[PDB]
């Protein structure tokens, strides 16, 4: 696995995208919406894929439920993670959402969601009900619930947006002024000490109290508070750099020696060939970690009373706070 995640552009592999998922230096695919038709399809797609890189790749999609759930037909919907906390049961939910979640991903032969959603309040209007909570202990409670979930049916796990994008509220990026964000922080640092965060998604925030850069591409908060001071051993991804420091290929070198393990390039595929063309080959071995640990179909998934339960659950959670 190399460094860099990128995507493609709709149901199908194009020969062009054969020829890039070639490339050592691709780590990971990226999905989205575009790129689902059917669950059929869907499986189609990720095992051509896993057969045009030839060697281990992720795969990966932005599937967090509520505002935020890439697939939707033919897919349990997942409610907002704001919703768990709201019911009466809300621990015993928010680890339904999680497993429920993670294994219709992987019987669809995708290898992770980046998720869960750690940071704090509804304000930052990007955020909103993607949040679980609004206060330490709810945050930390519901998502620890939703990551055991993933956790169970083995898929690896993706805090985002460290060190906390919760408190944003016109420039090309967006800034949280706060001379403290500890509490924010405080709750990142509760899941990595837990050990149960394989990856880090940093936020494209600046936090001028604490350094210049957005914490996507700061040496600072990547590498001193993340690593040094928290001591996260899992995988630093960096934000997407399609979007100072020049093109392509010196924005994802700034990325990597800022502490970014890997790199994402989404919805520009001629900054990600350009990338491919001109970054000397580096291998992210440690990347492997995120592969999905378990196997298996839907059919056979939905012989779980598990699944039973926690696809009718869902639905009627969804109702309950519609
Ligand atoms: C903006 C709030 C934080 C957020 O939603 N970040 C998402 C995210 N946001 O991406 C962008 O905002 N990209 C962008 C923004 C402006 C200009 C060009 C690209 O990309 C990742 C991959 O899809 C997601 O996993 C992240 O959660």
């Not at 095992?47 to 999609?61: E, M, S």
């Not at 309040?121 to 979930?149: M, P, W, Y």
């Not at 796990?157 to 460290?162: A, C, E, P």
Request: hydrophobic share 45%; with cysteine.
């Amino acid at each position: 696995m190399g460094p860099l995640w990128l995507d493609v552009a709709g149901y199908e592999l194009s020969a062009e995208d054969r020829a890039i998922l070639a490339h050592p230096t691709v780590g990971g695919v990226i999905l989205f919406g575009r790129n689902y038709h059917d669950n059929q399809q869907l499986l189609a797609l990720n095992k051509a894929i896993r057969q045009a890189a030839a060697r281990p790749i992720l795969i990966g999609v932005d599937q967090e439920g509520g505002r935020v759930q890439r697939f939707r037909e033919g897919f349990s919907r997942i409610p907002p993670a704001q919703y768990y906390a709201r019911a009466e049961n809300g621990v015993e939910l928010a680890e339904q959402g999680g497993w429920l979640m993670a294994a219709e991903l992987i019987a669809h032969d995708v290898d992770l969601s980046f998720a869960p959603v750690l940071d704090m309040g509804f304000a930052c209007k990007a955020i909103g009900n993607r949040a679980f909570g609004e206060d330490v202990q709810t945050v930390l409670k519901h998502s620890s619930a939703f990551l055991r979930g993933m956790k169970a049916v083995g898929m690896a796990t993706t805090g985002k947006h460290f060190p906390g994008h919760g408190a944003v509220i016109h420039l090309e990026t967006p800034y949280d002024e706060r001379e403290t964000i500890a509490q924010d922080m405080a709750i990142f640092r509760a899941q990595i000490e837990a050990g149960v965060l394989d990856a880090m998604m940093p936020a494209h925030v600046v936090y001028p109290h604490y350094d210049a850069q957005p914490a996507s591409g700061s040496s600072y908060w990547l590498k001193q508070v993340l690593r040094e001071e928290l001591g996260f051993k899992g995988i630093v991804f960096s934000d997407d750099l399609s979007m100072v420091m020049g093109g392509p290929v010196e924005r994802s070198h700034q990325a990597l020696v800022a502490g970014c393990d890997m790199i994402l390039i989404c919805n520009k595929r001629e900054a990600a060939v350009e990338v491919l063309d001109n970054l000397p080959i580096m291998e992210v071995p440690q990347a492997e970690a995120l592969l999905k640990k378990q196997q298996f179909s839907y059919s056979e998934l939905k012989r779980l009373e598990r699944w039973q339960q926690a696809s009718a659950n869902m639905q009627r959670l969804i109702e309950q706070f519609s």
